[PDB]
Amino acid sequence: LSIGTKNVSIYRNTADEVIYAGPAHDVTNVDTVSLRRSLPVKKGSDNGTMRGNMNFAKSFPNGDKKSLVVVNLTAHVPVGVDATAVRTWMTSEVFPGATSSVTLDLATKGVIHLSDA
Amino acid sequence: LSIGTKNVSIYRNTADEVIYAGPAHDVTNVDTVSLRRSLPVKKGSDNGTMRGNMNFAKSFPNGDKKSLVVVNLTAHVPVGVDATAVRTWMTSEVFPGATSSVTLDLATKGVIHLSDA
Amino acid sequence: LSIGTKNVSIYRNTADEVIYAGPAHDVTNVDTVSLRRSLPVKKGSDNGTMRGNMNFAKSFPNGDKKSLVVVNLTAHVPVGVDATAVRTWMTSEVFPGATSSVTLDLATKGVIHLSDA
Amino acid sequence: LSIGTKNVSIYRNTADEVIYAGPAHDVTNVDTVSLRRSLPVKKGSDNGTMRGNMNFAKSFPNGDKKSLVVVNLTAHVPVGVDATAVRTWMTSEVFPGATSSVTLDLATKGVIHLSDA
Amino acid sequence: LSIGTKNVSIYRNTADEVIYAGPAHDVTNVDTVSLRRSLPVKKGSDNGTMRGNMNFAKSFPNGDKKSLVVVNLTAHVPVGVDATAVRTWMTSEVFPGATSSVTLDLATKGVIHLSDA
Amino acid sequence: LSIGTKNVSIYRNTADEVIYAGPAHDVTNVDTVSLRRSLPVKKGSDNGTMRGNMNFAKSFPNGDKKSLVVVNLTAHVPVGVDATAVRTWMTSEVFPGATSSVTLDLATKGVIHLSDA
């Protein structure tokens, strides 16, 4: 049981959310990957939207205490779209940009203006 | 200007959000990447949280209409946490897991059980 | 994990119901098999009934839209009845009749008269 | 007049239900196969749904008394779907799973979690 | 899936409890091993307690009817206590005494005086 | 006076509970094994239930303070159930599973999924 390069185990299991714990996760150190979903609700003429949330939670030393660093990856896919097209777009266009230096600079410096070449 | 392997141009500029337009963005088709920041508010004694949001928006055919697929990547870093440690954690743990088949399955099928290998 | 000749995966888990997803299940297309149980409640003197429900759900083209076709197979077994006798009856009498052309005709044409051979 | 491998005869005949009796059916032993239909009601813009129910009823010794074991096979087919596609899906995908060991284990043990290969 | 020398299967999966059924478990007989947990609650300054419960249930002939024999095993480990110290305490001091003839006499006859050697 | 491999002495003697103290028990540290019983009460037609309880209490360093780790083992045996069957069930089915690594994982980490072998 692995997510990416990190081996995990099932920690908690609800109907629409499964929380997995990393090897370091314990009662005082948080190391968790949550997979949560919101299933499409057919309302009116709209068929709904599937929401997929991937949560990374890690404990970090903050001065004397511990702080929780959280990274969320959320996708909103309306019902009726071709899944293969969305997967290809996510692989070719979303993934390379989401794991680039832009994400790190935005996280640790608040950089929203890109530069330059 | 590039975001990963995609060339973009500044499209909308605000104080805390910049929207960049991809090569396919026009009046009819959406192809955008947005960078948004929520700077820490060090109220009282707590030093606040830096929130970095990266938004990917793409229009897709859905029957006769068009539907927006949105992918969100948000980092919540409390103030005082070492930036280098957070960047190392994001690069070695979050980035490989957020670009695996697990993310694609969760987004396009709502799969929250990553069995079993 | 297999149901007959179809490979399935755990999709949704509840206390008394489990939904498995087929290879064609995604945000746009439904391909699911659900197993539900109603355990006996031995109120007063009656030992109750065990209710086992099997649900097959598949999306189909219907003009411009999609329509859900659902097949239900429910067994109501009162408590105290020999399990082996019930299984023999289901295998020898119920199963051959529930997979004949009679079931197909009833489902797709509403035929309730099985004349004449 | 046969249903599956069981020879039956017409026992009762209404507009939307025909009850057939097996060779053993009598005034004290129940051995019946009912075919019931609910015809589509064209209401609003919805063209309705054809419901087809196949009921197997059998009397079984339960201690000192006799209990009724009932198996229901219900199909809900919306108007406008291709009937050949539904029949092919039912033959190749519904029937093998509905007459497997999964159904027997669900009926006689309440097993909703599948295992393992 | 083994708990000791017993081959079990998942029977009910809840966020804080998983019930495993043995070979002799069915609708009318009970053969179950239930794992239960109460995760620590960081209330005030106390980090909480980790509560783990392992339940054994079996049906037994009791004259005319069938009675349920239940063996419970609950551990209370406060957060912050070294886990390795607790595990060697249980292995060497709790487990050998909890599986001796003292438990058998206490369970069947209520013997609380273990005289004398 | 032995409970397993531990040499204990009588520390408290009441009608339905005897507390024995280990070699490390004193005024400021807890090292105790308590045997408790609830004798059957012939209430109405029910012959009652014998309840047995084995309690293990130890003190452990918890940061600055000393925390109490408690392991409980409770058995409920209805009156009329054959004692030898219960004893062989505990010896063969309950004891081997109650002293395995599953107990340690449940007590220290709250693991309720014993995947997979």
- Give the nearest chain D residue to C84 (CA atoms): D108
* Position B59, amino acid: S
Collapsing DSSP to helix, strand or coil, A28 comes out as: coil
Per-residue DSSP letters for B69-84? EEEEEEEEEETTB-HH
CB E66 within 8 A of CB E60: yes
Residue E115 is given by DSSP the state -
Chains E and D touch, contact meaning at least 3 pairs of CB atoms under 8 angstroms apart: yes
CA distance B94 to B87: 10
User: What are the backbone angles phi and psi of residue B45, rounded to the nearest 5°?
Assistant: -105, -30
Query: Is E60's CB within 8 Å of F98's CB?
Result: no
- Give the nearest chain B residue to C24 (CA atoms): B109
CA distance B30 to B25: 5
CA distance E67 to E61: 6
In F, residues 75-114, which contact A (CB 8 Å cutoff)? 109, 111, 113
Query: Is A16's CB within 8 Å of C12's CB?
Result: yes
Residue D89: CB atoms within 10 Å: 17
- Give the nearest chain B residue to A86 (CA atoms): B108
Query: Is A81's CB within 8 Å of C27's CB?
Result: yes
CB C40 within 8 A of CB C49: yes
What subunits make at least 3 CB pairs under 8 angstroms with F?
A, E
In D, residues 16-55, which contact C (CB 8 Å cutoff)? 16-18, 20, 22, 33, 35-37, 39, 50, 52-54
Which residues 6+ apart lie within 8 Å of F116 measured at CB?
A: B116, E1
- Give the nearest chain D residue to E8 (CA atoms): D115
CB A77 within 8 A of CB C27: yes
Query: Is E27's CB within 8 Å of D115's CB?
Result: no
Distance (Å) of CA B12 to CA B18, B32, B36, D23 = 6, 10, 12, 80
Residues in E touching D115 (Cβ below 8 Å) = 9-10
Chains B and E touch, contact meaning at least 3 pairs of CB atoms under 8 angstroms apart: no
CB A23 within 8 A of CB A7: yes
Technique used:
cryo-EM
Give the gap in angstroms from C-alpha B26 to the nearest C-alpha of chain A.
18
Cα torsion B62, B66, B68, B69: sign: positive
Collapsing DSSP to helix, strand or coil, B114 comes out as: coil
Residues in E touching F80 (Cβ below 8 Å) = 62-63, 67
> For the purposes of burial, counting CB atoms within 10 Å of the CB of B7, is it exposed (0-12), middle (13-18) or buried (19 or more)?
exposed
Provide the token pair at E3: 């708990």
Query: Is D4's CB within 8 Å of C97's CB?
Result: yes
CA distance B109 to B103: 10
Which residues 6+ apart lie within 8 Å of D114 measured at CB?
A: C1, C2, C3, C8, C18, C20, C35, D102
Query: Is C98's CB within 8 Å of D33's CB?
Result: no
CB F55 within 8 A of CB E74: no
Collapsing DSSP to helix, strand or coil, E102 comes out as: helix
Query: Is E79's CB within 8 Å of A13's CB?
Result: no
| Strand ranges, E, within chain C | 2-3, 6-7, 9-13, 17-21, 31-38, 49-62, 65-78
Query: Is B74's CB within 8 Å of A77's CB?
Result: no
Collapsing DSSP to helix, strand or coil, B110 comes out as: coil
CA distance C22 to C33: 8
Residues in C touching E13 (Cβ below 8 Å) = 13, 15
Nearest-CB residue to F113 (from A10, A26, A27): A10
Nearest-CB residue to E27 (from D110, D113, D115): D110
- Pairing mode of beta strands B9-13, B17-21: antiparallel
The candidate with the shortest Cα–Cα distance to C19, out of C7, C37, C36, is C36
- Give the nearest chain B residue to C23 (CA atoms): B109
The candidate with the shortest Cα–Cα distance to F81, out of E59, E95, C38, A69, is E59
Query: Is B115's CB within 8 Å of C21's CB?
Result: no
CA distance D31 to D36: 16
Instruction: Kindly report the length of chain B.
Output: 117
Residue F70: CB atoms within 10 Å: 17
Distance (Å) of CA A70 to CA A33, A73, B112 = 10, 10, 19
* Position E92, amino acid: S
Backbone conformation region of residue D113, classed left if phi is above 0, alpha if psi is from -120 to 50, else beta? beta
CA distance E68 to E91: 29
Residue D24 is given by DSSP the state T
Torsion of CA A95, A98, A100, A102, to 10 degrees: 150
Distance (Å) of CA F47 to CA E63, E65, E105, E108, F39 = 12, 13, 19, 14, 11
CA distance A82 to A101: 30
CA distance E65 to E28: 12
Cis check: omega of the bond before C82, within 30 degrees of 0? no
As a whole number of Å, the CA-based R_g of chain C is: 17
Provide the token pair at D79: 């108007």
What subunits make at least 3 CB pairs under 8 angstroms with E?
A, C, D, F
Chains E and F touch, contact meaning at least 3 pairs of CB atoms under 8 angstroms apart: yes
Provide the token pair at A42: 């057919």
Residues in A touching C13 (Cβ below 8 Å) = 13, 15
Instruction: Kindly report the length of chain F.
Output: 117
What subunits make at least 3 CB pairs under 8 angstroms with C?
A, B, D, E
What subunits make at least 3 CB pairs under 8 angstroms with B?
A, C
